[PDB]
Amino acid sequence: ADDHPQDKAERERIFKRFDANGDGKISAAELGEALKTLGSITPDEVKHMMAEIDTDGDGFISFQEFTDFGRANRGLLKDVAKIF
Numbered sequence: 001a002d003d004h005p006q007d008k009a010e011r012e013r014i015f016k017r018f019d020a021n022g023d024g025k026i027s028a029a030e031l032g033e034a035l036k037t038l039g040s041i042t043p044d045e046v047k048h049m050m051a052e053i054d055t056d057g058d059g060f061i062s063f064q065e066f067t068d069f070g071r072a073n074r075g076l077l078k079d080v081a082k083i084f
């Protein structure tokens with residue numbers, strides 16, 4: 001319960017930035033395109049992240065999936081929340 005709705009706004013803003021078209025699902029091309037912001041990453045790493053973030057395995061990450069994974073590494077989202 002310590003988690004508040006304000007935090008979701010951060011995850012929603014970060015997940016919303018990944019969704020290129022905004023269909024609720026992010027594909028390697030979408031996540032990879034946003035990941036490019038790192039300026040030092042490869043497509044094979046972005047594809048692996050999806051295989052790890054993809055809870056069902058449909059090939060895309062949804063806000064719900066990103067949230068479940070964001071909780072496993074909240075400290076990770078704080079790093080991307082600064083890149084954008």
Ligand SMILES: [Ca+2]
Nearest residue numbers: 022023025026
């Ligand atoms: Ca999408």
Ligand SMILES: [Ca+2]
Nearest residue numbers: 057058060061
């Ligand atoms: Ca999925």
